[PDB]
From a paper:
To reveal the structure of the C-terminal region of LACV-L and the overall architecture of the complete polymerase, we determined the structure of full length LACV-L (LACV-L FL) by X-ray crystallography and high-resolution cryo-EM. Transcription is initiated by a “cap-snatching” mechanism, whereby host 5′ capped RNAs are bound by the L cap-binding domain (CBD), cleaved by the L endonuclease domain several nucleotides downstream, and then used to prime synthesis of mRNA2,5,6. The previously unobserved C-terminal region (1752–2263) protrudes away from the core and forms an elongated arc-shaped structure that includes the mid domain (residues 1752–1841 and 1978–2025), the CBD (residues 1842–1977), and the ZBD (residues 2026–2263). We also capture snapshots of LACV polymerase in both pre-initiation and elongation-mimicking states, thereby revealing, amongst other conformational changes, the movement of the priming loop that unblocks the active site cavity and permits accommodation of a 10-base-pair template-product duplex, characteristic of elongation.
LACV-L FL was crystallized and its structure solved at 4.0 Å resolution by molecular replacement using LACV-L1-1750 as a template, revealing two molecules in the asymmetric unit. There was clear extra density showing repositioning of the endonuclease and for the previously missing C-terminal region, but the resolution was insufficient for building an accurate model. The X-ray and cryo-EM structures reveal the same overall arrangement of LACV-L FL. In the crystal structure, α-helix 91 protrudes away to bind to a hydrophobic pocket present in the ZBD of the second polymerase of the asymmetric unit, forming a domain-swap dimer.
Numbering used by the authors: 0 to 424, 438 to 548, 555 to 878, 892 to 1031, 1037 to 1407, 1423 to 1530, 1544 to 1614, 1622 to 1636, ...
Write the structure that this text describes.
Amino acid sequence: GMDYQEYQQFLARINTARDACVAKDIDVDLLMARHDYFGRELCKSLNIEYRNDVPFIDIILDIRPEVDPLTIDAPHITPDNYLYINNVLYIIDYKVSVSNESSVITYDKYYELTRDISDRLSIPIEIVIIRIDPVSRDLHINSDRFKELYPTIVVDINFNQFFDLKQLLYEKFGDDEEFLLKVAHGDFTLTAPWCKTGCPEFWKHPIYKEFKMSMPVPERRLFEESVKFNAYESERWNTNLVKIREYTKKDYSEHISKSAKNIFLASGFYKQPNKNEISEGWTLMVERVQDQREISKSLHDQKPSIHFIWGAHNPGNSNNATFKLILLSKSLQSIKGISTYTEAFKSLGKMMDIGDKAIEYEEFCMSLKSKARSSWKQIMNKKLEPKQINNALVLWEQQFMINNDLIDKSEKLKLFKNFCGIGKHSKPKILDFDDANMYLASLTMMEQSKKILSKSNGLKPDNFILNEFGSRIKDANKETYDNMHKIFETGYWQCISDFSTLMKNILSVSQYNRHNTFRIAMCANNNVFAIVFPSAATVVYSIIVLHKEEENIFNPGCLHGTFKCMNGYISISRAIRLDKERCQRIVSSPGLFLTTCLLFKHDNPTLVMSDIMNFSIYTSLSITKSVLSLTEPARYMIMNSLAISSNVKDYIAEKFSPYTKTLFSVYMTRLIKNACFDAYDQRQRVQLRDIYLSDYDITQKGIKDNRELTSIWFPGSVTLKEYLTQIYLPFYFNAKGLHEKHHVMVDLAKTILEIECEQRENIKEIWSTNCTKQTVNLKILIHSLCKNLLADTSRHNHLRNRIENRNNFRRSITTISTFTSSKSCLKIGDFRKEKELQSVKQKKILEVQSRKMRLANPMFNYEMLRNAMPNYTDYISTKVFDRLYELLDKKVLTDKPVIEQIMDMMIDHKKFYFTFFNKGQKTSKDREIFVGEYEAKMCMYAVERIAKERCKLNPDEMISEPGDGKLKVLEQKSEQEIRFLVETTRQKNREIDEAIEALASNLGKIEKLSLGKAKGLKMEINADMSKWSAQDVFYKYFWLIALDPILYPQEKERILYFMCNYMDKELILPDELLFNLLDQKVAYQNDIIATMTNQLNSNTVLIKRNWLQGNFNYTSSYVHSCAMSVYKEILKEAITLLDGSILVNSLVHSDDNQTSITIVQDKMENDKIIDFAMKEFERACLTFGCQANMKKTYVTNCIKEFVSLFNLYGEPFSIYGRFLLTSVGDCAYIGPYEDLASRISSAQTAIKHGCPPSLAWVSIAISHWMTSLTYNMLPGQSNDPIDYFPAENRKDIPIELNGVLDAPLSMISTVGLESGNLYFLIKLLSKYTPVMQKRESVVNQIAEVKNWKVEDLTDNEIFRLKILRYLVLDAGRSILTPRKFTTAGSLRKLYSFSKYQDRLSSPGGMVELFTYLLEKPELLVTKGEDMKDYMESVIFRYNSKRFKESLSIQNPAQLFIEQILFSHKPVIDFSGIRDKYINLGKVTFTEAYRLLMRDLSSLELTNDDIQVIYSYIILNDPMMITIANTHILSIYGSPQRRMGMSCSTMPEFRSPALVLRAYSKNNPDTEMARDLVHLKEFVENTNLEEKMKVRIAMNEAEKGQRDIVFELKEMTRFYQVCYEYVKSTEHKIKVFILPAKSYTTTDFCSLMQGNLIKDKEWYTVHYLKQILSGGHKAINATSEQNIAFECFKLITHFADSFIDSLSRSAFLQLIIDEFSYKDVKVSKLYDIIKNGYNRTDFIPLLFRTGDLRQADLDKYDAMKRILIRSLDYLNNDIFSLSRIKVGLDEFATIKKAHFSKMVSFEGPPIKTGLLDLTELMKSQDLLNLNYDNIRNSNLISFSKLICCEGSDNINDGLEFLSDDPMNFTEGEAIHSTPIFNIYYSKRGERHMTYRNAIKLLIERETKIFEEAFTFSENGFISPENLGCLEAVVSLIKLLKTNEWSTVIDKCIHICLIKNGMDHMYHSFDVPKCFMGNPITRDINWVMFREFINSLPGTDIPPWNVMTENFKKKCIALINSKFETQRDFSEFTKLM
RNA sequence: UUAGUAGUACACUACU
Ligand SMILES: [Zn+2]
């Protein structure tokens, strides 16, 4: 990026400097260094000459020197650069800054002065100031004339390297306040106050009394003093803040020492995990569980592991519906024996008989299905009636009627009372997992499963996934394709998939399942069936299977019993009562399952594939809560047990509680138990990779991947990365929303009331010194607040200004999202009236639904609560957008500034109320959400937001960093430590290491000195705080508001009052919880809920110290940061004692914490400091009121846990798996494209977090599978659109119609779904383009499109383009989307929806809205900027029936079934499809394909229509421009192993609602005026201004009068398509893990491309031309130049690196003339360099050719006193093209380029004795700049570099190679606790030249070739063998020159030239033996043939296989020559 | 709103 020379000198100046005024100048010099750097590279980007601080009076003299500068008055300014074209002078003053505030100042200053001579000379002078952003990198130019000149400018600039120097300078001097004084943009500017008057009540409040009670009396007054302090009044802002700092400095200075001095007190005794410590924990766990749960040893109490019973399919019987129905009927009737429900199952088969009348079932059912398939809506009013067939009364296809005559009254009861459990109505029941005869039973269940499921399907291993994605999986990694087959083949896959396909059909049936009906559900298996019994939503089902022989059935613990029938055996499973939410997951279980297996097995050959799948079905299908209780606690139980410092005992003895209800759970528990002990013995089995560090980051970082560790869930060995996956991944198998709300509300309530009681009874004291639970070290707090509050205001002065802007404090409440959102909200008051009326309605609807059930199968309160509970404070649920509307209409909210309204609300609202609703997430331990009043939301907003922008300043806080941005931060901080550790070790041990190499004589004396030295120590505290919210003093936060400098006194009074009320805040127990406790039935022994509510009197309990979970994150997080800031100071004083160095780095995120400590020792042992660090860690937490959970907290020597994002020893790594398990049931079930959109987004996310392409593609397959399974769009399904459309396969069917996503992953990762459309257009620009222009930019290939011929194209090719233009372009672009008939639902709670009723009811008032909205069309798309505007927007919104539904929650489970059932019904309205073709009702999916073709065939494809596609898609979006370029200019290079992974940021490829108001009326309300100009162009170029008006203007003559509906609906479309153009998208933080650091776009592109090709090897990427094009106005000049630079940089270095010094000019001269780099002649590139204005870059090149003149030297010398003859003399002994002396010791620079580019050279061969330097250029292996790599290289690699034309003495011929020394890589151990070797590049000695390397290679490798090709006991001598050699090398020329043969020839050649036998080799033709007659050149193939067989061969590596293949090839080939398949008639003609 | 009466409608259908 930047120059290396200036970096080194600026780094040294930071250490050299001591005083702040010296450090000041280093910051000033760094600005100019960046200033010129931007200018140097931009001048080449614009092709102009570079200049610096050139006077304006001289700039005119270049244009017109006839008038002298004295008489003509020119403005005396100092511009940077100038240009004169088109009779206009353009003045340049480039500058790099974040804001244009510094640019407009210099703009108007220049514009004013330049006008003095602008009218004097009558030549207009334009000011062109170019500014670039130093982080986001965006170009900003003010000149409009300059915009039209340069359409696109190349800006791949690097500031990343500049900020590295800034970090160093603001580290040493950043602590000193003398340096902070010098950096200022106003010193300190405090903005306008948010309030006018203070708060008197705050000083009176009893909580403020209680605050000062505990506090000491000097502190009491200080708090008074601090609040009343105004920062704007006193001379400086830090008057008070420093004053209170200096008071507490007595106790602080002492307490910092106190903690630090404990380093000597410590011992080598810390909570370390050990086999016994784990064992002890388990035993106390057993005791706990055996009390807390009812332990059972009986095998009848178990629950099903899986809720399914699979049995082998029967191919002998027919696979057809009607047949199976009767088959199961007779089968069920035929059941023989006696049980409980035997005669019940018997009659059920009897009630589904058809027999003779099989054909009547085929018709009757098809009529009913056809009746429903006609209508969009369901068939209402008409009564469904059954038809008597044999004994059964069929109601629908596979639906029957329960006939009360066919079953006994007693036998009907048995089935429903006992078996189905309809009418059945104290510890939990669990299985003893410590019983070996229970663990046995559990193991035998697995042994049983493996015995049956391992057996193959025997059916074709070809399903949609493999059929359509197999190709794209296989090419990524062939292993995974096979792995997939291995699964699909095995009964495992058929078992799950048939349960999936069966459940889909169980749900589909269960929807219309009545109370007098039992339904039958069949699957792809013709033995497996299911019976769905009447449900009293709840699905009641049994799996009924007809397995072959007895016990050829899989029972996981689900089966009721097997039964013998009259033909075979039939088994019926226990009645399962599951919920649709659970069942859904079972349907998507195969996708979950495949991923599980593939992820585990991936690239690990030691694992048993049949054992992975054996475990996987029991996970992917496990829907019980038994499993979650294992999967979650395991993650910590393993990691704790393999960490260094960690408390396992306590975690296993308290936090671990198995709920082993099922039988898999028992087996899985013991898998975990065992895995805990294996960890302890593997702690030291972890190794640390050899770190190849050579300045600016490291490649080959992180942990060593060694397969020495042991797996957890199955047998085999595993890698660390894989071990971690096996540890953490299990938890993501867990299922969401399993927690029954009835139980959650109780346990959530109980906990809050338990911890509040704790505080009420036990915790009384607030502050303390000894450090105790819920206590803060008040003196230490106040100081550490003061110190940080200073540094978080000194580093940014406008801090109060930044808060106002970024959080919209000044603007009206109606603008901020958090307030105008559709989130849940709590309303307080009295609703006893409507709450009673809303309840009794449902209590009647209860009886309504019961009355109807009494007729068919006779099986069978809010008033009470209010009457019973006296002190019941009444509340209600509402919406956040609705509350705002309510508070405005009743006028308490206004257009007053939101903060100004907040301040008043803090003092107005005095009592705060909060309610909780459960999340019920995948975790077994349930999480609560506290949601209270809207009034509260406003208060917390300010307090939290003020802390937000404060927290952002501190780099330690990470809640500030949105998205997965933390991952890179982990890395950047880990790398800083790995570097520091090395740097510091080399700085101390250098004195000792010198003596070691000196003596190494006797080695017995060396060990004495090698012991007594410095010792490295790294450690990471992977923390997790205990009860961050509940067990935390809220009183401490009062001080943060008090001490605050950027808060006014009248604000400070008001903030603290609200917080004073947030102590007397009440928790409302929601009614649903109170209803559970309403019906007593004997109360709880010790009822905590009743205790706190006084035997249930009030529904409110007061919560004090427990500030509610998530309400004060940032606030608490700043105090956390302040706490860890102390921990730093503690250790940093402790390590100065021992005399060494320490680097502590703390990452803070509310409750999740990570703190990395790196120490270089001298005195005491490493293990002492380990215990010391942990002591002060808890101390640091507890001195601030927070307590650290030592249970979950673990410490490693590498690993970093932080928010579950993991960084290893530099190498960042997340659990790629967790995101692949999302693409299964994560969608809103809207449409085929709409579903896939989010399912592929989940796959895109995996790639970010370092996922292999092979597995990435799997998710893409699964996603498609589920997507197509939802709407019956799979191959062979109903809506299968391959026959309906013209196409070969689903790759060619548009993804809008649902097909497959045919694109490269490197595109899908970037854009996705749209990629599939983009690839179909790039395919064309690689088919329908000529030989010229195709190799050039994409832009050029788009110009040729309008010169194509339409007739050339094919049916499919035409088909895409027609939809792509007439449909896709304008309409998340979908065409097919099913519409529903859903109802609005109950919207009574809403106030705002009532005001729509009143405006709809009263006549005229409706139209009045729409007529008002037409004069303000800004309020159709965006919400109002003012009260009325926002309010009336809310009412209009209700117009949409979709927005009315949006505020109601539909179950995705129910939504899923509704898209299956409504697929054969008319759902897609064609009206909205045909409208576009023209500019009936709903249409069925099948008909939608037909009716699309009837319209499509009519449309016309032109040479223009196609050119609109290539404009609107490619040429419009600068991103799509580059993506297409990257895939056309792509040149994939060297395949390499993924050694070093690094984090990389996604690059850039680039007023809202107020602008649209200035479009409605052209007058705005200055910068916003300029924004409308480009908006005018957008609407005029597309011409959508007229197109919209014409569409309305001709509709009023179509309809008749004035339709207000069309007046708006068409006007809204016009404003919504504006929104996307006007309101710009925020470039959110996206981090991709790549094989190296991506600085700029091009770098990112190359590394991204190469990461998503193969799994085993990543590839480095090249490009012919620049890929970064900006549009279709910008059509090469800037793409050419850089090629010339690359070329000559490459050549000069290749020449001075490898070619002999003596003959380097000749080489260059030969290369320049007859050669070409990247299809451009090197001469033309040289001419481009010579005609350029940066010749100073290529001084040594120009001198060597004789194209260097004095002007260049004079310029070069002026950039950073010379003569030509001086150079001519000086460089008489320096022979290099990359370097010439331009002084006494100053050499010239050529700037080295990478050597992976030399392949892009194409010229005639240059032969040098024997070597062909062209082939050395074209070589891959022999281009490394490492001596050892080339010395220890293969002869196969070198054998390409030989021609020799009969040379001699190989030693002589190698004279044309560099006899200059090469660079070797040396490595050394670092002497850390995690001991690793650093490897770096040295310069070797002298005898390490390129020649000697080649020679040593030749010698070593030829010796091995000789002994392999002896074929006798002689050698490479003895003509008896030379004859054999001649024979073997003869055939090689008379056969076929493939690739294997030629190598042998050239190797033999080499070997014979070496031995001095190259005076005959060239005169070696076929011997006399083989040649019958010498003259008559006849060949005896038979002889030759038998000669090849008669060759013995050798088995020495590496030639053993080489020779073997050669022989076979040559034999086969020879035999081929003979074998000529002649025509049968041919010979019959000749003779 | 309130009450009474009569109703409430459909997927897989496979190499198995
Ligand atoms: Zn030769």
